[PDB]
């Protein structure tokens, strides 16, 4: 966690210099410490000697239910909060529907398979429907209005906007308790933006940074991170903890397969897409 910069004054930095460091926007001893001298020196009323004293003394101090029961059993009860679970599958498999369902189930009591936290829906595809959220909320008997109140929503127009929303997510997730972060068509902007072959490393780098920010937020807030992937990157293998393959069974009933878990078996479960919900298959 953080090591608030207050602790730096006990090292014998005078408090005025700490206030100037806070003015710069450095608020922890960790924050000042792993930065060079010039950042603290550039602050008004701070010399190089005080900065050397600061750096030297600073180094001294520094399960959400899927709502398909059969799928929950496949997952041993639902998504583990604090980790990334990847569901890769074809279009029309219900990925957007699953996102809408989870956006509400996260708000469920933990004893009901929720995280008792607010939800975060980052859309890149325009498919965000508050009315679908209302349907899922009424399914689980949650207030649809409260679902929208526990879902902060923003549509990312590009990869840069996609990463920029993470900055708002990190500061906003501190102020309110969240349990779910949704990124729908998470890989589409990496395909439309990064379309070249020479750009493979570029999309991989942007994705890597995006994933690292995701991991930091997951470890920071203990929330579930849900991203959706269409498989028509090898970087995701190390990053996803649980890989789910989704394929259509005709009508509204979908087949789920586990394609990676270091602990969980490779296995499959059948579920359906119902007006209210993403919910177990009911032949």
- Residue 52's binding partner among its own copies, another protein, none (Cβ under 5 to 8 angstroms by kind) is another protein
* Residue whose token pair is 């308790």: 177
Q: Is 90 annotated as a binding residue?
A: yes
Concatenated DSSP letters of 189-203: HHHHTS-SSTTHHHH
212 binds its own copies (CB under 8 A): yes
* CB burial readout 10-22, b (16+ within 10 A) else e: ebebeeebbebbb
**Cβ 40 to its own copies shortest distance, Å:** 14
**Footprint of another protein on 106-145 (CB under 8 A):** none
- Selected binder of its own copies within 19, 27, 69, 129 (CB under 8 A): 129
Residue 91's binding partner out of its own copies, another protein, none, with CB under 5 to 8 Å set by partner kind: its own copies
Give the binding-site size for another protein (rule: CB under 8 A): 19
Closest CB 109 distance from its own copies, rounded Å = 26
> Cα separation of 210 and 41, whole Å?
31
Q: Which residues in 24-50 are b (16+ Cβ under 10 Å) and which e?
A: bebbbbbbbbebeeebbeebeebeeeb
55 interacts with another protein by CB under 8 A: yes
Burial 101-126 (b: 16+ CB within 10 A, else e): bbbbbbbbeeeebbbebbbbbbbbee
Sign of the Cα pseudo-torsion (74, 79, 82, 83, in order): positive
CB 113 within 8 A of CB 106: no
Binding segment toward its own copies, per CB under 8 A, in 41-49, 67-75, 101-109, 124-132: 124-132
Query: CA 34, 37, 43 angle in degrees (round to 5)?
Result: 110
Structure tokens at 113: 């398979």
> What are the counts of helices (DSSP H) followed by strands (DSSP E) for the chain?
13, 9
When asked if residue 92 is in the footprint of its own copies (CB under 8 A), the reply is yes
Shortest separation between residue 219's beta carbon and its own copies, angstroms: 7
Is residue 92 a known part of a binding site? Answer: yes
* Among candidate residues 67, 81, 68, 93, the one with its CA nearest the CA of residue 185: 93
- Residues 6-45, one symbol each (x = binds another protein by CB under 8 A, - = not), give ---------------------------xxxxxxx-xx---
Q: Which does 39 bind (CB under 5 to 8 A by kind): its own copies, another protein, none?
A: another protein
253 binding its own copies? (CB under 8 A): no
Annotated binding residue 96: yes
| CB of 169 closer than 8 Å to CB of 119 | no
Contact between 240 and 85 (Cβ < 8 Å): yes
Taking the C-alpha atoms of residue 131 and residue 128, their distance in angstroms, rounded to an integer, is 9
Give the footprint of another protein on residues 182-201 (CB under 8 A): 201
Considering only residues 26 through 45, tell me which ones interact with its own copies, judged by CB under 8 A.
Answer: 34, 36
- Point out which residues bind another protein (CB under 8 A): 33-39, 41-42, 52, 55-56, 59-60, 201, 205, 208, 212, 234
State the binding site. Answer: 89-96
- Point out which residues bind its own copies (CB under 8 A): 34, 36, 83, 91-92, 96-97, 125-127, 129, 131-132, 157-158, 160-161, 185, 188, 192-193, 195, 205, 208, 212, 219, 230, 232, 234, 237-238, 241, 260, 262-263
State the binding site for ATP. Answer: 89-96
């Amino acid at each position: 966690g953080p090591q608030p910069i207050s602790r730096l004054e006990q090292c014998g930095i005078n408090a005025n210099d700490v206030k100037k460091l806070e003015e710069a926007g450095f608020h922890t001893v960790e924050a000042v410490a792993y930065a060079p001298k010039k950042e603290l020196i550039n602050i008004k009323g701070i010399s190089e000697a005080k900065a050397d004293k600061i750096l030297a003394e600073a180094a001294k101090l520094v399960q959400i239910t899927t709502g398909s029961k059969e799928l929950d059993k496949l997952l041993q009860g639902g998504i583990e909060t604090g980790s990334i679970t990847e569901m890769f599958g074809e279009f029309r498999t219900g990925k957007t529907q699953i996102c809408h369902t989870l956006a509400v189930t996260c708000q469920l009591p933990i004893d009901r398979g929720g995280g008792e936290g607010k939800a975060m829906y980052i859309d890149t595809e325009g498919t965000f429907r508050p009315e679908r959220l209302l349907a899922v909320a009424e399914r689980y008997g949650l207030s649809g209005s409260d679902v929208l109140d526990n879902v902060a929503y923003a549509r990312a127009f590009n990869t840069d906007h996609q990463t920029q929303l993470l900055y708002q997510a990190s500061a906003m997730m501190v102020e309110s308790r969240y349990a779910l972060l949704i990124v729908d068509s998470a890989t589409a902007l990496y395909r439309t933006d990064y379309s070249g072959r020479g750009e493979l490393s570029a999309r991989q780098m942007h994705l890597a940074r995006f994933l690292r920010m995701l991991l930091r937020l997951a470890d920071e807030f203990g929330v579930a991170v849900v991203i959706t992937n269409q498989v028509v990157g090898n970087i995701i293998a190390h990053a996803s903890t649980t890989r789910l393959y989704l394929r259509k069974g005709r009508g509204e009933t979908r087949i789920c397969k586990i394609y990676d878990s270091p602990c969980l078996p490779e296995a499959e479960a059948m579920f359906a897409i119902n007006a209210d919900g993403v919910g177990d298959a009911k032949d």
